[PDB]
């Protein structure tokens, strides 16, 4: 089988992407944030604290004839950005872009932190990292991808994120019309539960390529590109007036700047992030100081190839026995 679903930026900055997901019988369609950096499928629901729901579409298990409470199961997750959610668990039918999983763990939020409440466009997350990170207790549950894997024509899903525009998540096949040239595959470590890989280096604008190993994760759930302080300094040093601001919480630059591109290495191949992709606009409405889309990973503890990087490529998440990542230009 295969699945194919359009993924749409939630706002003008591509802060995140939402993808429609059918849950239950009859279908309840929720717009979830597909997150290759976590492994829980959780939704706003009829069980979510009322004060913590503000505009999201909720999953109501009692209205689904295929929903079954997973007796005793709870979940609790905290994300890299400080946000969190928790609740109980149902199993139900979950379909993405025509691809259907029965008995999918659907994690029903009883509580969400303010940032989720404040984002009315995101009804939940659908995790696509490795199931070893799944927070369900006392019985860990499988991701949607893990559950579909066996049924899929090929044990893969692809992320084709748009710049200021819709894109596509495909399950079980590689759309050879969706990219240019070849896909370069690179090794993955699953030891931390992430799509962890090692970039072979970078260039800033038209600068020479620096060969250097950069270990990081392919994370659709993170907006920006988080890299070592040395790398990020080298980038922002090419933008007049750019500076790291403690008060703002990262590199900012004059909104009047034209940003240089950033190239990262995938084996011998190169992915070019256009400068425009690295502009996340005024730090506050009407400010002439703009937030950078490349930021330091120091104090995160891991480098993150977030959407800023991933949307410049067609990315293959290969879930074969030995998982690998593939990147193509597009």
From Swiss-Prot:
Gene Ontology BP term (one): proteolysis
Record-listed E.C. numbers: 3.4.23.22
UniProt keyword annotation of Disulfide bond present: yes
Alphabetical keyword list: Aspartyl protease, Disulfide bond, Hydrolase, Protease, Signal, Zymogen
GO MF term list: aspartic-type endopeptidase activity
Disulfide pairings: 255-290
Positions of the Peptidase A1 domain: 17-328
Active-site residue numbers: 35, 199
Protein family according to the UniProt entry: Belongs to the peptidase A1 family.
Protein name: Endothiapepsin
Designated gene of the protein: EAPA
């Amino acid at each position: 089988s295969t699945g194919s679903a359009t993924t749409t930026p939630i706002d003008s900055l591509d802060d995140a992407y939402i993808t429609p997901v059918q849950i239950g019988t009859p279908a309840q369609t929720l717009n979830l944030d597909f997150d290759t950096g976590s492994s829980d499928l959780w939704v706003f629901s009829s069980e979510t604290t009322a004060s913590e729901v503000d505009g999201q579409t909720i999953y109501t298990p009692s209205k689904s004839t295929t929903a079954k409470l997973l007796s005793g199961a709870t979940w609790s997750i905290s994300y890299g950005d400080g946000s969190s959610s928790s609740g109980d668990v149902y199993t139900d039918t979950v379909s993405v872009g025509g691809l259907t999983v029965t008995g999918q763990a659907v994690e029903s939020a009883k509580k969400v932190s303010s940032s989720f409440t404040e984002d009315s466009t995101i009804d939940g997350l659908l995790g696509l990292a490795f199931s070893t990170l799944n927070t369900v207790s006392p019985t860990q549950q499988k991701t949607f991808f893990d559950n579909a894997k066996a049924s899929l024509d090929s044990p893969v899903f692809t992320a084709d994120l748009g710049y200021h525009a819709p894109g596509t998540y495909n399950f079980g096949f590689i759309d050879t019309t969706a990219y240019t040239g070849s896909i370069t595959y690179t090794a993955v470590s699953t030891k931390q539960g992430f799509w962890e890989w090692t970039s072979t280096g970078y260039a800033v604008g038209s600068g020479t390529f620096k060969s250097t190993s950069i270990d990081g994760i392919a994370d659709t759930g993170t907006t920006l590109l988080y890299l070592p302080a040395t790398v990020v300094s080298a980038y922002w040093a090419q933008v007049s007036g750019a500076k790291s601001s403690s008060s703002v919480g990262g590199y900012v630059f004059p909104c009047s700047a034209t940003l240089p591109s950033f190239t990262f290495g995938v084996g011998s191949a190169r992915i070019v992030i256009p400068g425009d992709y690295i502009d996340f606009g005024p730090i506050s409405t009407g400010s002439s100081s703009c937030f950078g889309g490349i930021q330091s990973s120091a104090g995160i503890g891991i480098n993150i190839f977030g959407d800023v990087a991933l949307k410049a490529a067609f990315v293959v998440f290969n879930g074969a026995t030995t998982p690998t990542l593939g990147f193509a230009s597009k």
